Amino acid sequence: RPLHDLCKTTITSSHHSSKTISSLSPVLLGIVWTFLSCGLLLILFFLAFTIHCRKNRIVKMSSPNLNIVTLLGSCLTYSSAYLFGIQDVLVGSSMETLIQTRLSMLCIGTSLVFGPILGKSWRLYKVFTQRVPDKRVIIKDLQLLGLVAALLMADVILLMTWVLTDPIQCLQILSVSMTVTGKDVSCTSTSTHFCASRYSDVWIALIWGCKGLLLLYGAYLAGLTGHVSSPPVNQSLTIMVGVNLLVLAAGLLFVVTRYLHSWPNLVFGLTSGGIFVCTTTINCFIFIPQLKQWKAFE
Amino acid sequence: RPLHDLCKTTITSSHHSSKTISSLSPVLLGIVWTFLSCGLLLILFFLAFTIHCRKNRIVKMSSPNLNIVTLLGSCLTYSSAYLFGIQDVLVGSSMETLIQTRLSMLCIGTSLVFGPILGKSWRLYKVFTQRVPDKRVIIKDLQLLGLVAALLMADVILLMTWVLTDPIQCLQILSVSMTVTGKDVSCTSTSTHFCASRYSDVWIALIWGCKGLLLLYGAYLAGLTGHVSSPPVNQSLTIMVGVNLLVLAAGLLFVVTRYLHSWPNLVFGLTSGGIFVCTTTINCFIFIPQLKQWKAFE
Numbered sequence: 001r002p003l004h005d006l007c008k009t010t011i012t013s014s015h016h017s018s019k020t021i022s023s024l025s026p027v028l029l030g031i032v033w034t035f036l037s038c039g040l041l042l043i044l045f046f047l048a049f050t051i052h053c054r055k056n057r058i059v060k061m062s063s064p065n066l067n068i069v070t071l072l073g074s075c076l077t078y079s080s081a082y083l084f085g086i087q088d089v090l091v092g093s094s095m096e097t098l099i100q101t102r103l104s105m106l107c108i109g110t111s112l113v114f115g116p117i118l119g120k121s122w123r124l125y126k127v128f129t130q131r132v133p134d135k136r137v138i139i140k141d142l143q144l145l146g147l148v149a150a151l152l153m154a155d156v157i158l159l160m161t162w163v164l165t166d167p168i169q170c171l172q173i174l175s176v177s178m179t180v181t182g183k184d185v186s187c188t189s190t191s192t193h194f195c196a197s198r199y200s201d202v203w204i205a206l207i208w209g210c211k212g213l214l215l216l217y218g219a220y221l222a223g224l225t226g227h228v229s230s231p232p233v234n235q236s237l238t239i240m241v242g243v244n245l246l247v248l249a250a251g252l253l254f255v256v257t258r259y260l261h262s263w264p265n266l267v268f269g270l271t272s273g274g275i276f277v278c279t280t281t282i283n284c285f286i287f288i289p290q291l292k293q294w295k296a297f298e
Numbered sequence: 299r300p301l302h303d304l305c306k307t308t309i310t311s312s313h314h315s316s317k318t319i320s321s322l323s324p325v326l327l328g329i330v331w332t333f334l335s336c337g338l339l340l341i342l343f344f345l346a347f348t349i350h351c352r353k354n355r356i357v358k359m360s361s362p363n364l365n366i367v368t369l370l371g372s373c374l375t376y377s378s379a380y381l382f383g384i385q386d387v388l389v390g391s392s393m394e395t396l397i398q399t400r401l402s403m404l405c406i407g408t409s410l411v412f413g414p415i416l417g418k419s420w421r422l423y424k425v426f427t428q429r430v431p432d433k434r435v436i437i438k439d440l441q442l443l444g445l446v447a448a449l450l451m452a453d454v455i456l457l458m459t460w461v462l463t464d465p466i467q468c469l470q471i472l473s474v475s476m477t478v479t480g481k482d483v484s485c486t487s488t489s490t491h492f493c494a495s496r497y498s499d500v501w502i503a504l505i506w507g508c509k510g511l512l513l514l515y516g517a518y519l520a521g522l523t524g525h526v527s528s529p530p531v532n533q534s535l536t537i538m539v540g541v542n543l544l545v546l547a548a549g550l551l552f553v554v555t556r557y558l559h560s561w562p563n564l565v566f567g568l569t570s571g572g573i574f575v576c577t578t579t580i581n582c583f584i585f586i587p588q589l590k591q592w593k594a595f596e
């Protein structure tokens with residue numbers, strides 16, 4: 001086949017390669033940074049609220065420490081959202097660790113946001129509908145923090161495995177492809193530049209499947225604790241809203257970032273919007289009833 | 299531009315090219331066929347049991363109509379499992395129709411298996427939680443059949459959109475790709491054959507996301523009804539086991555059928571095993587207790 005000969009013929013012309021350029025509209029960057037900054041101000045306000053209010057009874061009911069953990073997760077997610085608006089500004093290898101750290105912080109933030117809510121719901125379950133003759137004396141926060149720490153350990157083990165076994169090789173390939181049907185023959189000259197890793201679907205499937213099992217157990221716990229207490233401590237509504245919103249946003253953003261790596265503005269806007277919507281919805285559902293009942297107190 | 303001419307010359311140097319086909323070992327086919335045959339014998343046994351004893355207290359309480367709908371879904375699922383092993387037989391254009399029909403029966407069978415259980419759980423919830431003065435006199439079986447039919451119609455709309463928008467075209471592609479990572483130049487020639495759509499991840503994501511929302515609502519419903527009735531009627535355990543098994547099997551089979559197209563025997567065995575395990579587990583969880591309390595009562 002003359003394909004091997006033309007191999008080395010194109011290798012000479014392969015001496016150079018495109019270095020990529022920035023094409024992210026400034027206006028969009030400004031708008032998304034403004035909205036994420038407003039969200040971060042809201043998160044910091046909630047952190048300050050829970051720190052300053054630790055003696056109110058709504059505080060004791062809504063487990064302020066786990067809410068601090070959730071707010072830290074939200075801060076990580078907004079940091080990842082900020083880093084999403086860093087494209088082609090740098091020409092160095094940093095893009096490698098840029099994408100790596102961005103996805104790592106997405107995963108860590110999602111785990112740190114969703115673990116504490118499921119832990120609170122599991123206590124509520126175990127302390128309300130397990131009034132067995134052997135009294136459930138105490139199930140302290142330390143146990144839930146340990147469960148969240150174990151989940152974070154599993155997620156970060158997956159992250160180390162992904163990074164150290166198959167990193168995000170930033171490579172550009174030019175290739176002529178001869179797609180032939182049963183009766184029709186065609187040739188194409190496709191040349192694309194994508195920062196992706198081999199076995200990408202493997203890693204996406206493992207991370208998303210682990211998170212999916214977590215979300216299924218969270219939906220189960222929200223079902224168990226659906227009609228067991230007041231909304232400030234029930235957390236079933238927020239668990240379900242967050243789970244469906246997370247599934248929808250995750251699927252949409254995965255499709256968009258896959259099949260539309262030619263519309264950088266669209267991908268960035270959609271990703272920032274999805275992260276903002278999910279994080280803000282979770283934090284608002286968690287904290288707004290607390291504010292309402294505190295204000296009703298005084 | 300310099301590669302353009304070389305690629306044009308290569309396309310002319312096609313000379314009809316060649317195609318590659320192979321057959322599985324006639325032992326894995328036999329094992330798969332006999333195991334799915336035993337599964338279908340079990341399903342037909344449960345069908346006959348429900349048809350013959352739909353007058354006992356346990357069977358009537360266990361909603362025999364929803365169970366026969368589930369059994370029909372299981373029969374469709376094993377039919378799809380059979381069609382996974384008739385692959386590499388229809389050499390002509392029927393291969394695309396084979397894959398299309400196979401995946402369509404997978405979707406229809408999954409919907410028909412996981413709809414009736416959620417319908418049963420929703421009635422149970424509404425009859426053990428509507429103590430309001432507006433008595434829930436009768437929530438008819440026809441309403442649960444209506445919901446199952448609506449979900450099936452939604453699945454058919456999605457399948458029709460997939461078939462008539464971006465269908466499965468079988469293409470053989472041989473191409474030469476030059477990978478440049480910015481520090482080294484590499485050339486590779488690959489001749490690969492696969493049957494897929496141009497927007498495969500779009501359709502997979504949409505279908506699996508709709509099914510995921512269904513599974514999340516099913517986990518929620520299993521949570522509500524988790525400690526509400528007897529096992530032969532609760533159906534929370536079967537919902538949870540089936541949902542987790544379905545998620546694990548779906549992810550595993552996706553990864554294997556994507557990244558191991560050069561290992562036909564492994565993909566076929568794994569797909570048949572996953573379908574067999576999921577369907578048999580669901581049907582056994584549904585029906586074995588019914589048999590136990592029937593034989594105990596008689």
Ligand SMILES: CCCCCCCC/C=C/CCCCCCCC(=O)O[C@H](COC(=O)CCCCCCCCCCCCCCCCC)COP(=O)(O)OC[C@@H](O)CO
Nearest residue numbers: 025028032035245248249263264265266269272273274276
């Ligand atoms: C949880 C699940 C449900 C949640 C919903 C899931 C998704 C969440 C999404 C929200 C979507 C945000 C709005 C989408 C806007 C995307 C912009 C876009 O897509 O349009 C552009 C065309 O205009 C431009 O060139 C950009 C200039 C104007 C930008 C402002 C327009 C919208 C103004 C403000 C937008 C910021 C919103 C701030 C809110 C909070 C977000 C933190 C694509 O151009 P292109 O890609 O370059 O195409 C050409 C190609 O050939 C080569 O260039």
Ligand SMILES: CCCCCCCC/C=C/CCCCCCCC(=O)O[C@H](COC(=O)CCCCCCCCCCCCCCCCC)COP(=O)(O)OC[C@@H](O)CO
Nearest residue numbers: 404405408494495498501505506509545548551556576577
């Ligand atoms: C309770 C009892 C039921 C238990 C059932 C267990 C699930 C078993 C199966 C999972 C899929 C089986 C594997 C066959 C599917 C892949 C074979 C195939 O046809 O290939 C496809 C290409 O097709 C398409 O383009 C569209 C596919 C549409 C899928 C329809 C629904 C599938 C299934 C829907 C039913 C379940 C939904 C998800 C469940 C709940 C979710 C947890 C992938 O493209 P590729 O090979 O990667 O491309 C290589 C690259 O070079 C170019 O893309």
Ligand SMILES: CCCCCCCC/C=C\CCCCCCCC(=O)O[C@H](COC(=O)CCCCCCCCCCCCCCCCC)COP(=O)(O)OC[C@@H](O)CO
Nearest residue numbers: 103106107109110113196197200204207211250253258278
């Ligand atoms: C806290 C409250 C909720 C917070 C809201 C979170 C929103 C989640 C949303 C969207 C995800 C961000 C979108 C970026 C996803 C990665 C895409 C990307 O940028 O790079 C990819 C490639 O990457 C890889 O190679 C490895 C992928 C790593 C995935 C793990 C990331 C950590 C975990 C990630 C999930 C984190 C959330 C887990 C929830 C789960 C809900 C179910 C491009 O692939 P390709 O170009 O198509 O391949 C071309 C082909 O030829 C060769 O591969």
Ligand SMILES: CCCCCCCC/C=C\CCCCCCCC(=O)O[C@H](COC(=O)CCCCCCCCCCCCCCCCC)COP(=O)(O)OC[C@@H](O)CO
Nearest residue numbers: 323325326330333560561562563564567568570571572574
């Ligand atoms: C819930 C259970 C625990 C969880 C397990 C999850 C799934 C459960 C179920 C089934 C797993 C299926 C096992 C897959 C093993 C087959 C794949 C494999 O591994 O070997 C393949 C096959 O080789 C052969 O052709 C000769 C061996 C044939 C006999 C296989 C023995 C299996 C019989 C096993 C025991 C009998 C059980 C009957 C099974 C009931 C399942 C319904 C080689 O690959 P290849 O593609 O041809 O390579 C060539 C490449 O280089 C270029 O052509």
Ligand SMILES: CC(C)CCC[C@@H](C)[C@H]1CC[C@H]2[C@@H]3CC=C4C[C@@H](O)CC[C@]4(C)[C@H]3CC[C@]12C
Nearest residue numbers: 161162164165166198199202203205206553557
């Ligand atoms: C049983 C569960 C909990 C743990 C198993 C997780 C699986 C999916 C993990 C564990 C080790 C991982 C493998 C580690 C090394 C490689 C080699 C690489 O070139 C391809 C990916 C591959 C093959 C990984 C695929 C995913 C993998 C198999």
Ligand SMILES: CC(C)CCC[C@@H](C)[C@H]1CC[C@H]2[C@@H]3CC=C4C[C@@H](O)CC[C@]4(C)[C@H]3CC[C@]12C
Nearest residue numbers: 201204205208209212215216506507510513514
């Ligand atoms: C029911 C919930 C909790 C779990 C399932 C949610 C669904 C919608 C999510 C979670 C895991 C995700 C899958 C994980 C594995 C992959 C590999 C990816 O490269 C293609 C899409 C695909 C197949 C994802 C599709 C969307 C997905 C199936």
Ligand SMILES: CC(C)CCC[C@@H](C)[C@H]1CC[C@H]2[C@@H]3CC=C4C[C@@H](O)CC[C@]4(C)[C@H]3CC[C@]12C
Nearest residue numbers: 226236237238240241242244245248511515518
């Ligand atoms: C893209 C669009 C068309 C899909 C719409 C998805 C719909 C069905 C989703 C989005 C949000 C979901 C709701 C989110 C929260 C709750 C509260 C819970 O106590 C009952 C279910 C309920 C009410 C969900 C029902 C299904 C729901 C409405």
Ligand SMILES: CC(C)CCC[C@@H](C)[C@H]1CC[C@H]2[C@@H]3CC=C4C[C@@H](O)CC[C@]4(C)[C@H]3CC[C@]12C
Nearest residue numbers: 248251252253255256257259260263266267270
């Ligand atoms: C509130 C509702 C409307 C938001 C739900 C998300 C929907 C509407 C979003 C998610 C992804 C979006 C699509 C993503 C990509 C494209 C391709 C582009 O060339 C045309 C627009 C189109 C088709 C977008 C239209 C709107 C869209 C479908």
Ligand SMILES: CC(C)CCC[C@@H](C)[C@H]1CC[C@H]2[C@@H]3CC=C4C[C@@H](O)CC[C@]4(C)[C@H]3CC[C@]12C
Nearest residue numbers: 273276277278279280281282284285286288289
């Ligand atoms: C324009 C888009 C992209 C930004 C949307 C911002 C999101 C986070 C905002 C818009 C409306 C807000 C909601 C308005 C009303 C309520 C009801 C309240 O009982 C819980 C909080 C909740 C649910 C808010 C949460 C945050 C919220 C969802």
Ligand SMILES: CC(C)CCC[C@@H](C)[C@H]1CC[C@H]2[C@@H]3CC=C4C[C@@H](O)CC[C@]4(C)[C@H]3CC[C@]12C
Nearest residue numbers: 459460462463464465496497498499500501504
């Ligand atoms: C709740 C209902 C309205 C959601 C409907 C979502 C529909 C509109 C989305 C999901 C899948 C998407 C399709 C995916 C694939 C294709 C084939 C492509 O060549 C044209 C765009 C097209 C046709 C998309 C159109 C928009 C689309 C059909």
Ligand SMILES: CC(C)CCC[C@@H](C)[C@H]1CC[C@H]2[C@@H]3CC=C4C[C@@H](O)CC[C@]4(C)[C@H]3CC[C@]12C
Nearest residue numbers: 154210213214217220524534535538539542543
């Ligand atoms: C690789 C490892 C992490 C896989 C672990 C899968 C585990 C988490 C899955 C498989 C079996 C599932 C369990 C099946 C049965 C029950 C009993 C039910 O009353 C509560 C849910 C519960 C407890 C499920 C929890 C999740 C579960 C334990």
Ligand SMILES: CC(C)CCC[C@@H](C)[C@H]1CC[C@H]2[C@@H]3CC=C4C[C@@H](O)CC[C@]4(C)[C@H]3CC[C@]12C
Nearest residue numbers: 546549550551553554555557558561564565568
């Ligand atoms: C519940 C848990 C234990 C289920 C685990 C299923 C695992 C063991 C199954 C599912 C996917 C399978 C893998 C699919 C792909 C490969 C790559 C091949 O070159 C060696 C076999 C190997 C590595 C298989 C080993 C067995 C395997 C990893």
Ligand SMILES: CC(C)CCC[C@@H](C)[C@H]1CC[C@H]2[C@@H]3CC=C4C[C@@H](O)CC[C@]4(C)[C@H]3CC[C@]12C
Nearest residue numbers: 333539570571572574575578579582583586587
């Ligand atoms: C490759 C195929 C043959 C593997 C099949 C594994 C099957 C037989 C295993 C996996 C799950 C197991 C079931 C798990 C749950 C139950 C319910 C219990 O009340 C009776 C035992 C029973 C019914 C088990 C029977 C054996 C079982 C169905």
